[PDB]
Amino acid sequence: AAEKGFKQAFWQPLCQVSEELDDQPKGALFTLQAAASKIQKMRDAALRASIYAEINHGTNRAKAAVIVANHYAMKADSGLEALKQTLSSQEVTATATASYLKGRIDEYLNLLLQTKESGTSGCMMDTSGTNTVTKAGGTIGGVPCKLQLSPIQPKRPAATYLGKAGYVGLTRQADAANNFHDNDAECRLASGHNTNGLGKSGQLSAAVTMAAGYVTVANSQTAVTVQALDALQEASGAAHQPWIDAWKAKKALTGAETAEFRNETAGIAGKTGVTKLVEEALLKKKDSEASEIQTELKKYFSGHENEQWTAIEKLISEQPVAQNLVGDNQPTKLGELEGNAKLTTILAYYRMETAGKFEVLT
Amino acid sequence: AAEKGFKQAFWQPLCQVSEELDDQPKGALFTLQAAASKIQKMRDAALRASIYAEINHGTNRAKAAVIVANHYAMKADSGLEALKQTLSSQEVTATATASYLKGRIDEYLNLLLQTKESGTSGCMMDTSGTNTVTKAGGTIGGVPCKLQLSPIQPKRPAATYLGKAGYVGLTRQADAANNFHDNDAECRLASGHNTNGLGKSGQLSAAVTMAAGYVTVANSQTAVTVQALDALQEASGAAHQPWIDAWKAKKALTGAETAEFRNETAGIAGKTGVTKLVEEALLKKKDSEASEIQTELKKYFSGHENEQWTAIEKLISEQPVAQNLVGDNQPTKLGELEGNAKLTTILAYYRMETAGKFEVLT
Numbered sequence: 185a186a187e188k189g190f191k192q193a194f195w196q197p198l199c200q201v202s203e204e205l206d207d208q209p210k211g212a213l214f215t216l217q218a219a220a221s222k223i224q225k226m227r228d229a230a231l232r233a234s235i236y237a238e239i240n241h242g243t244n245r246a247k248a249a250v251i252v253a254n255h256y257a258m259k260a261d262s263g264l265e266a267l268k269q270t271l272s273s274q275e276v277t278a279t280a281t282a283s284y285l286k287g288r289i290d291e292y293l294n295l296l297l298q299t300k301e302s303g304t305s306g307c308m309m310d311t312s313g314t315n316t317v318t319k320a321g322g323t324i325g326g327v328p329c330k331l332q333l334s335p336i337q338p339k340r341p342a343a344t345y346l347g348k349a350g351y352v353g354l355t356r357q358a359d360a361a362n363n364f365h366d367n368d369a370e371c372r373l374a375s376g377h378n379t380n381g382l383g384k385s386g387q388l389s390a391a392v393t394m395a396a397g398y399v400t401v402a403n404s405q406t407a408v409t410v411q412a413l414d415a416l417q418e419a420s421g422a423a424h425q426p427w428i429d430a431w432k433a434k435k436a437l438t439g440a441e442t443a444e445f446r447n448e449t450a451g452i453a454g455k456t457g458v459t460k461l462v463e464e465a466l467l468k469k470k471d472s473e474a475s476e477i478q479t480e481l482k483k484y485f486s487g488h489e490n491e492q493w494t495a496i497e498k499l500i501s502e503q504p505v506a507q508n509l510v511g512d513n514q515p516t517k518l519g520e521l522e523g524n525a526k527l528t529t530i531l532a533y534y535r536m537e538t539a540g541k542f543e544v545l546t
Numbered sequence: 547a548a549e550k551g552f553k554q555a556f557w558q559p560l561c562q563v564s565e566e567l568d569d570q571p572k573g574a575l576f577t578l579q580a581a582a583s584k585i586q587k588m589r590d591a592a593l594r595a596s597i598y599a600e601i602n603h604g605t606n607r608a609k610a611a612v613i614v615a616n617h618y619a620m621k622a623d624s625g626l627e628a629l630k631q632t633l634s635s636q637e638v639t640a641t642a643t644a645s646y647l648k649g650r651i652d653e654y655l656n657l658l659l660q661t662k663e664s665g666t667s668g669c670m671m672d673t674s675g676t677n678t679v680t681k682a683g684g685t686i687g688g689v690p691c692k693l694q695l696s697p698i699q700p701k702r703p704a705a706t707y708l709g710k711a712g713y714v715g716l717t718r719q720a721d722a723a724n725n726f727h728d729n730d731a732e733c734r735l736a737s738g739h740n741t742n743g744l745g746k747s748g749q750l751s752a753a754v755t756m757a758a759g760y761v762t763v764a765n766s767q768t769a770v771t772v773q774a775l776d777a778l779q780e781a782s783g784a785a786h787q788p789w790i791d792a793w794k795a796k797k798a799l800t801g802a803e804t805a806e807f808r809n810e811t812a813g814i815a816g817k818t819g820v821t822k823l824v825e826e827a828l829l830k831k832k833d834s835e836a837s838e839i840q841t842e843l844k845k846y847f848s849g850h851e852n853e854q855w856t857a858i859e860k861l862i863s864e865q866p867v868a869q870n871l872v873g874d875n876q877p878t879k880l881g882e883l884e885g886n887a888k889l890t891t892i893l894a895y896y897r898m899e900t901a902g903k904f905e906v907l908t
């Protein structure tokens with residue numbers, strides 16, 4: 185009936201979205217950290233290749249290790265520039281839009297949860313619309329609904345409730361009078377009329393919209409209107425803009441999964457850096473033919489397809505640094521040493537060794 | 547009087563906090579980007595030093611430039627690890643806590659803004675408590691209150707309404723009956739009693755708290771109670787935990803201003819990397835007394851205080867590159883070249899030259 189407490193078929197959907205939005209910061213955390221860890225891994229690969237080039241100068245595989253090292257430096261570099269330029273705003277924008285909307289929902293839902301008179305007359309009713317609900321654990325009567333933001337630790341959010349299309353549970357309502365509103369449980373929050381709703385001496389001046397422009401409450405003796413948020417299109421100035429915004433933001437996310445954070449397993453001449461380095465340094469001739477790139481590569485790699493890039497990488501990994509550099513009975517092989525700070529210093533030990541030579545050498 | 551619409555004294559404070567908490571994402575953005583830009587600048591300095599050590603390999607000036615280059619690599623490296631480990635969660639946590647609380651406030655304030663009957667009876671009143679206020683632009687009658695989250699673009703923001711100790715304007719209220727509540731404007735949201743408040747056939751079951759546990763609304767014919775939020779202590783399970791949380795998070799922020807993102811202008815032996823590199827590579831005597839560190843440094847730097855570190859740095863920034871390595875009419879000096887990707891390339895050209903000179907020589 186109109187101007188009556190809300191039955192679970194109204195509020196369970198909003199609970200689901202609130203609890204799903206709760207994971208958006210956790211996701212943002214996960215991604216921002218994933219981007220640095222990946223930048224770090226590319227850096228580590230370039231450090232390992234550089235150190236091999238320093239130890240093994242004179243050989244051709246040393247020149248190969250420089251091309252490997254420059255590619256991974258460039259990866260590690262474009263990763264940090266992607267983090268700055270794209271990923272930071274994206275995850276901040278997702279975290280903020282989702283949290284602001286979660287706040288809006290939660291305030292409304294906790295109003296309803298609190299405006300009750302008896303255990304059978306109130307604003308928040310069970311499915312049956314026989315009793316009011318009570319929070320127990322992080323559920324409002326069994327339904328998982330904490331109505332507060334959980335502590336942010338990294339993890340991937342689900343997209344069940346907010347998908348690529350909009351809010352799936354916030355479909356159109358055909359019969360709000362019956363499916364949302366109880367037959368008799370009283371709620372003044374259910375209308376804007378002075379009799380069984382929010383008006384005191386009169387109906388209010390106009391319709392009130394609640395939950396960030398989700399539900400409209402009229403000053404007339406009528407039932408609620410809810411927006412269908414399941415098939416959204418981007419808009420501005422929309423009454424339920426918060427909903428649009430959290431959707432649009434979540435929808436724009438790529439994660440630390442773009443090109444820059446992914447390794448390339450194609451042919452050597454195609455890898456980030458190779459052809460342009462071969463033209464500039466080795467060939468000293470710009471805009472050359474793919475064959476003459478292929479040729480130079482065969483000198484260092486023994487070919488030009490991914491299996492020779494790995495073979496060099498294997499040499500780089502098997503390559504051991506001095507025990508004087510890494511501890512006691514500790515792992516000395518480069519493939520077994522990780523950590524930018526650690527590897528940056530092993531590199532400076534060998535950059536120092538290379539200076540020593542060239543002062544006796546020239 | 548009790549069970550009456552709220553006068554500007556009550557709501558202007560919440561407007562101020564909502565609007566301040568609007569800048570928290572903008573700040574988070576600003577910092578996350580500031581951290582990458584600073585990591586980038588340290589990297590650029592290590593790239594410039596490395597290239598000088600390459601272009602001049604085998605000298606003591608190249609040996610000095612290696613120590614400079616390893617310090618800046620280590621900075622750039624610990625910056626990305628600080629970004630990952632500390633700054634990411636910090637700014638995500640600040641953005642989410644603030645946005646969730648801004649959502650909670652805004653929903654309450656927009657309820658009040660909407661529950662009005664006449665232009666003189668309602669829930670949101672002016673200071674005089676004579677008229678109901680209205681939202682024009684991003685202001686509800688003069689006082690700035692957009693009641694929505696602004697688009698996130700970078701900004702450094704000075705906290706005035708939320709600061710180190712809590713929410714400044716959310717003071718203990720001595721006389722809510724008079725300073726908050728009007729004499730006669732009607733608001734059902736002002737109590738939980740069935741006569742002029744939210745109860746329908748009866749008072750509600752208990753007190754309702756609103757704005758994330760800020761204001762308590764009793765089922766009795768009484769005036770509102772508001773929490774003093776201006777001298778907070780961290781707590782758990784608190785009725786107004788959102789407030790505590792946004793405070794604690796904002797209070798924990800350091801910004802991209804920690805050690806790792808700041809340059810060190812102390813003596814050379816004290817700089818990040820120098821003594822440990824001198825012991826490991828040059829001295830090959832791990833655990834050497836600072837005088838013998840001072841000595842080695844004099845060989846490269848011509849001393850051991852900050853003015854010699856800069857002099858090397860001057861040489862480094864002076865050092866020109868090959869004309870072909872730069873754009874049509876672009877500068878060739880290292881001090882005049884910025885951009886990790888750009889400099890990573892110049893470094894690989896010279897790493898290749900060193901490769902070729904070492905074999906041309908050996």
Ligand SMILES: *[C@@H]1O[C@H](CO)[C@@H](O[C@@H]2O[C@H](CO)[C@@H](O[C@@H]3O[C@H](CO)[C@@H](O)[C@H](O)[C@@H]3O)[C@H](O)[C@H]2NC(C)=O)[C@H](O)[C@H]1NC(C)=O
Binds near residue numbers: 223225228447500
């Ligand atoms: C992009 O691809 C490169 C090449 O695979 C990655 O570098 C490699 O990273 C792994 C660790 O992730 C290192 O593996 C080592 O293998 C040895 C032998 O199997 C094992 O004993 C060690 O425990 C370790 O697993 C490998 O040495 C290293 N290779 C090079 C050339 O540095 C890089 O991490 C990838 N980047 C990203 C963002 O994933």
Ligand SMILES: *[C@@H]1O[C@H](CO)[C@@H](O[C@@H]2O[C@H](CO)[C@@H](O[C@@H]3O[C@H](CO)[C@@H](O)[C@H](O)[C@@H]3O)[C@H](O)[C@H]2NC(C)=O)[C@H](O)[C@H]1NC(C)=O
Binds near residue numbers: 594
């Ligand atoms: C930490 O300190 C180092 C050393 O000051 C910074 O590197 C230096 O960065 C500046 C640009 O920020 C470069 O300055 C150049 O100066 C010349 C001559 O005055 C001028 O013509 C150029 O337009 C440019 O301003 C300088 O070359 C560079 N020095 C080195 C050795 O790389 C570094 O940026 C600081 N780090 C952070 C995070 O601020």
